[PDB]
Amino acid sequence: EVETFAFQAEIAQLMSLIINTFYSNKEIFLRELISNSSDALDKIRYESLTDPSKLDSGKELHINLIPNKQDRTLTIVDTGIGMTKADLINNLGTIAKSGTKAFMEALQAGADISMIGQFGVGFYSAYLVAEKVTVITKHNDDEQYAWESSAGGSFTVRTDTGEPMGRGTKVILHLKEDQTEYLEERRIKEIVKKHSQFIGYPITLFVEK
Ligand SMILES: CNCc1ccc(Oc2ccccn2)cc1
């Protein structure tokens, strides 16, 4: 059972701007997704301060970066609070309509695309480098779900049959053909050190055979 939804108009415009504006500094997508993962980890940590059972679904709080050159995918995994089906609809737990409006105003006042994360819609910077994005997520209060979109105005949500995650979020970036530099170990390391060296969770960069 696959459900197909239309993006709200303003989110569709945000995605079209990210895809179609000439902007060479694409590497910021990874900073934004790691920052989102840190935010999600902070949330489950905070809930666990008063209810330890919130970590029955997994005590480890971490971020994994998994490149796969055969699949041409970069996957960012975190064991944060995850998202309910309702959160996945409703723009992956963001205030994306008002955030996009504020981001648009800033761009017209001289800001650039790299400020996107200050407006709460940093997730959509994934489309700087990905032709399709798959989000697998498990929240303590819901079942495991998969969100997917190749932009073009729509996304899908289905129950995830795949590997159980326990708790957290997996962002799978299906990279554009000309953006495979983001599968190279030395490139990922360089970006993580430049933008995320002080993240307060362990970031493990997986290697390949
Ligand atoms: C914005 N809150 C999350 C967060 C925390 C630490 C962090 O680390 C670095 C590393 C290099 C330069 C700047 N910040 C990056 C993001």
Coordinates of C-alpha atoms and ligand atoms in Angstrom, one line a residue:
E1 CA 0.0 0.0 0.0
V2 CA 1.6 3.2 -1.3
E3 CA 0.1 6.6 -0.6
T4 CA 1.0 9.5 -2.9
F5 CA 0.8 13.1 -1.7
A6 CA 1.3 16.5 -3.3
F7 CA 3.8 18.9 -1.7
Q8 CA 2.3 22.1 -0.5
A9 CA 2.9 24.7 -3.2
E10 CA 5.5 26.6 -1.2
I11 CA 7.5 23.5 -0.6
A12 CA 7.4 22.6 -4.2
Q13 CA 8.7 26.1 -5.0
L14 CA 11.5 25.6 -2.5
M15 CA 12.5 22.3 -4.1
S16 CA 12.4 23.8 -7.6
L17 CA 14.7 26.6 -6.5
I18 CA 17.2 24.2 -4.9
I19 CA 17.2 22.1 -8.1
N20 CA 17.3 24.8 -10.7
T21 CA 19.4 27.7 -9.2
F22 CA 23.0 27.7 -10.3
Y23 CA 25.0 27.3 -7.0
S24 CA 28.3 25.6 -6.8
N25 CA 28.7 25.2 -3.0
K26 CA 26.6 22.0 -3.0
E27 CA 28.7 20.4 -0.1
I28 CA 26.5 22.1 2.5
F29 CA 23.8 19.4 2.1
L30 CA 25.9 17.2 4.3
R31 CA 26.3 19.8 7.0
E32 CA 22.5 20.3 7.0
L33 CA 21.6 16.6 7.3
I34 CA 24.2 16.0 10.0
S35 CA 22.8 19.0 11.9
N36 CA 19.3 17.6 11.5
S37 CA 20.5 14.3 12.9
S38 CA 22.1 16.0 15.9
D39 CA 18.8 17.8 16.5
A40 CA 16.9 14.5 16.4
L41 CA 19.4 12.9 18.8
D42 CA 19.1 15.9 21.2
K43 CA 15.3 15.3 21.2
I44 CA 15.4 11.7 22.3
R45 CA 18.2 12.4 24.8
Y46 CA 16.0 15.1 26.4
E47 CA 13.0 12.8 26.6
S48 CA 15.1 10.1 28.1
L49 CA 16.2 12.5 31.0
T50 CA 12.8 12.0 32.6
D51 CA 11.7 8.6 31.1
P52 CA 14.6 6.2 30.7
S53 CA 12.4 3.7 28.9
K54 CA 12.5 6.0 25.9
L55 CA 15.8 4.3 25.1
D56 CA 14.5 0.8 25.3
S57 CA 14.5 1.0 21.5
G58 CA 18.3 1.7 21.5
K59 CA 20.7 3.3 23.9
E60 CA 23.3 4.3 21.4
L61 CA 23.2 7.9 20.1
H62 CA 25.2 8.2 17.0
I63 CA 25.4 9.2 13.3
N64 CA 26.7 6.9 10.5
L65 CA 27.7 8.0 7.0
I66 CA 27.5 5.1 4.6
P67 CA 28.7 5.6 1.0
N68 CA 27.9 2.9 -1.6
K69 CA 29.5 3.4 -5.0
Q70 CA 27.6 0.4 -6.6
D71 CA 24.2 1.8 -5.7
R72 CA 25.4 5.4 -6.1
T73 CA 23.9 6.3 -2.7
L74 CA 25.1 8.2 0.4
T75 CA 23.1 7.2 3.5
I76 CA 23.0 9.3 6.7
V77 CA 21.8 7.2 9.7
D78 CA 21.0 8.5 13.1
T79 CA 19.5 6.9 16.2
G80 CA 17.5 10.0 17.1
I81 CA 13.9 10.5 18.0
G82 CA 12.6 9.5 14.5
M83 CA 9.4 10.6 12.9
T84 CA 5.8 9.4 13.0
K85 CA 3.8 8.9 9.8
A86 CA 2.1 12.1 10.7
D87 CA 5.5 13.9 11.0
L88 CA 6.6 12.5 7.6
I89 CA 3.5 14.0 6.0
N90 CA 3.7 17.6 7.3
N91 CA 7.1 18.0 5.7
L92 CA 9.3 15.6 7.7
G93 CA 8.6 17.3 11.1
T94 CA 9.5 20.8 9.9
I95 CA 7.7 24.2 9.7
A96 CA 8.4 24.2 6.0
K97 CA 5.7 26.6 4.8
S98 CA 6.7 29.4 7.2
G99 CA 10.4 28.5 7.0
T100 CA 10.4 28.7 3.2
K101 CA 8.7 32.1 3.4
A102 CA 11.4 33.4 5.8
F103 CA 14.1 31.8 3.6
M104 CA 12.7 33.5 0.5
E105 CA 12.7 36.9 2.3
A106 CA 16.3 36.4 3.3
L107 CA 17.4 35.5 -0.2
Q108 CA 15.8 38.6 -1.6
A109 CA 17.7 40.6 1.1
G110 CA 21.1 39.2 0.1
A111 CA 21.3 35.8 1.9
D112 CA 22.5 32.8 -0.1
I113 CA 21.4 29.2 -0.4
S114 CA 23.9 28.1 2.3
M115 CA 21.7 29.8 5.0
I116 CA 18.9 27.4 4.3
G117 CA 19.3 25.5 7.6
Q118 CA 18.7 28.6 9.7
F119 CA 15.1 28.5 8.4
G120 CA 14.4 24.9 9.5
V121 CA 14.2 23.5 5.9
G122 CA 17.8 22.3 5.6
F123 CA 16.6 18.8 4.8
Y124 CA 15.6 19.9 1.3
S125 CA 19.2 20.9 0.5
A126 CA 19.5 17.1 -0.1
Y127 CA 18.3 17.9 -3.6
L128 CA 21.5 19.9 -4.3
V129 CA 23.1 16.5 -4.9
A130 CA 20.3 13.8 -5.0
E131 CA 17.9 13.0 -7.8
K132 CA 15.8 11.0 -5.4
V133 CA 15.7 10.9 -1.6
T134 CA 14.4 8.0 0.5
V135 CA 13.7 8.6 4.3
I136 CA 13.3 5.5 6.5
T137 CA 12.2 6.3 10.0
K138 CA 11.0 4.7 13.3
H139 CA 9.6 6.8 16.2
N140 CA 8.8 5.1 19.5
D141 CA 5.1 6.0 19.1
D142 CA 4.6 4.6 15.5
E143 CA 5.6 1.9 13.1
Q144 CA 8.5 2.0 10.6
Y145 CA 7.7 4.1 7.5
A146 CA 9.5 5.0 4.2
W147 CA 9.1 8.5 2.6
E148 CA 10.3 9.0 -1.0
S149 CA 10.5 11.8 -3.5
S150 CA 12.2 12.6 -6.8
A151 CA 10.8 16.2 -6.5
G152 CA 8.4 17.0 -9.3
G153 CA 5.7 17.9 -6.9
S154 CA 4.9 14.7 -5.0
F155 CA 6.1 12.3 -2.4
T156 CA 5.1 8.8 -1.3
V157 CA 4.7 7.2 2.1
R158 CA 4.5 3.4 2.7
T159 CA 5.0 1.1 5.6
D160 CA 8.6 0.0 5.5
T161 CA 9.1 -3.8 5.0
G162 CA 12.9 -3.5 5.2
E163 CA 15.5 -4.0 7.9
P164 CA 14.0 -2.9 11.3
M165 CA 15.8 0.1 12.6
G166 CA 14.8 0.2 16.3
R167 CA 14.6 4.0 16.5
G168 CA 15.8 6.9 14.3
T169 CA 16.1 8.1 10.8
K170 CA 17.9 6.9 7.6
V171 CA 18.3 9.5 4.8
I172 CA 19.2 7.7 1.5
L173 CA 20.5 10.1 -1.1
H174 CA 20.4 8.6 -4.7
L175 CA 23.1 10.9 -6.1
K176 CA 23.0 12.7 -9.4
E177 CA 25.4 11.2 -12.0
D178 CA 27.7 14.2 -11.7
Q179 CA 27.8 14.4 -7.9
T180 CA 29.6 11.1 -7.1
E181 CA 32.5 13.0 -5.4
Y182 CA 30.3 12.7 -2.3
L183 CA 30.9 9.0 -2.3
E184 CA 34.7 9.5 -2.0
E185 CA 36.2 8.9 1.5
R186 CA 38.6 11.9 1.4
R187 CA 35.8 14.2 0.2
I188 CA 33.3 13.2 2.9
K189 CA 36.1 13.5 5.6
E190 CA 37.0 17.0 4.3
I191 CA 33.3 18.2 4.5
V192 CA 32.7 16.7 8.0
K193 CA 35.9 18.3 9.3
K194 CA 35.1 21.7 7.8
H195 CA 31.4 21.9 8.9
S196 CA 30.8 19.3 11.6
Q197 CA 34.0 18.8 13.5
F198 CA 32.4 19.7 16.8
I199 CA 29.0 17.8 16.6
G200 CA 28.4 16.3 20.0
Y201 CA 27.7 12.8 18.7
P202 CA 30.1 10.2 17.2
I203 CA 30.1 10.4 13.4
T204 CA 31.4 7.2 11.8
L205 CA 32.3 7.3 8.1
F206 CA 32.0 3.7 6.8
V207 CA 34.5 2.4 4.2
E208 CA 33.8 0.2 1.2
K209 CA 35.3 -3.1 -0.1
Ligands
LIG1 C1 24.3 24.0 15.1 N1 24.1 22.9 16.1 C2 24.7 21.6 15.8 C3 26.2 21.6 15.5 C4 27.0 21.5 16.6 C5 28.4 21.5 16.4 C6 28.9 21.6 15.1 O1 30.3 21.6 14.9 C7 31.0 22.5 14.2 C8 32.2 22.0 13.6 C9 32.9 22.9 12.8 C10 32.4 24.2 12.6 C11 31.2 24.6 13.3 N2 30.5 23.7 14.0 C12 28.1 21.7 14.1 C13 26.7 21.7 14.3

